[PDB]
């Protein structure tokens, strides 16, 4: 496993103000977010709260284990999950392009959410 | 059930001209490139890109297209593959696509289109191949 570099790996290829303004901007509208809307918080800054050791890191991986096996335990689909994922990009998306930041970075924070919430779904399927 | 077709029309409208070809393109003209291992454990991929990559915009190919990721789901889930196994090529599949349109020399702001469009149309081919 240790799963954990990977996941430092496609970190530590970020730069500071995108991991800051993305963090930050998961921690902000942090509430904002949790969004039902078709016919909570703590998650997103858990993931988006990303720093280096691994140990405050590790909690991540083996809580997003944690979080699927209870999904997949009760039986709700995974597709469920994964278009809950999408919202959740989406509106991440929507929150980043109005920000007065460059697009050079937007273009880092896009990739930046993107990769982060699919690894957790991708980590939370097991 | 339907309205999968809806949904996908619809994103597809939250993105420019140029994008939608720029990233079909892309993908086209590196359909046969981007089946790449590079690892591990345990010409299809291809017309599958294409297939996922045709900015399709008709509710007809829509459906089969739909379908067709629905069908591709099922035959994944008797061999009996984990959904992980899967999402993994997924994330590398973007990954890859990123990197290629990075090197691209585009306007920032196509970029961030084009990014976003890659990545959502995976992820909505891969949210609609889950059946297990
Ligand atoms: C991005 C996708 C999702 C994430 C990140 C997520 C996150 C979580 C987390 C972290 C828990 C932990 C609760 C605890 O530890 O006590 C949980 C529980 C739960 N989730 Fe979600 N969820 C997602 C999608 C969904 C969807 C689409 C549904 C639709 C019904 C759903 C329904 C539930 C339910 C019913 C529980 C209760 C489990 C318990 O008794 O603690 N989840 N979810
Ligand atoms: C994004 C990821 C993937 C896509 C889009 C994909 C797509 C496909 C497609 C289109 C077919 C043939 C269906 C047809 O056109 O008739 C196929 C077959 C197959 N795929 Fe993949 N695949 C993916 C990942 C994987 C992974 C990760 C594995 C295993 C670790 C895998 C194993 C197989 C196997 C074993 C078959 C043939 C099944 C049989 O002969 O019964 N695929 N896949």
Redesign the interface.
Known sequence: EQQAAEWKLLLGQFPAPVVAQIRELATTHQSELPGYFYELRQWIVSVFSMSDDDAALQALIAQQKQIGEIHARIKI???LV??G??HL??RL?VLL?QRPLD??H??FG??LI??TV??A???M??
């Open positions: 689909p995974i597709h994964l278009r994922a999408r990009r989406e998306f392009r697009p050079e937007k273009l896009q990739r993107s990769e699919d690894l779904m991708e980590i399927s097991r």
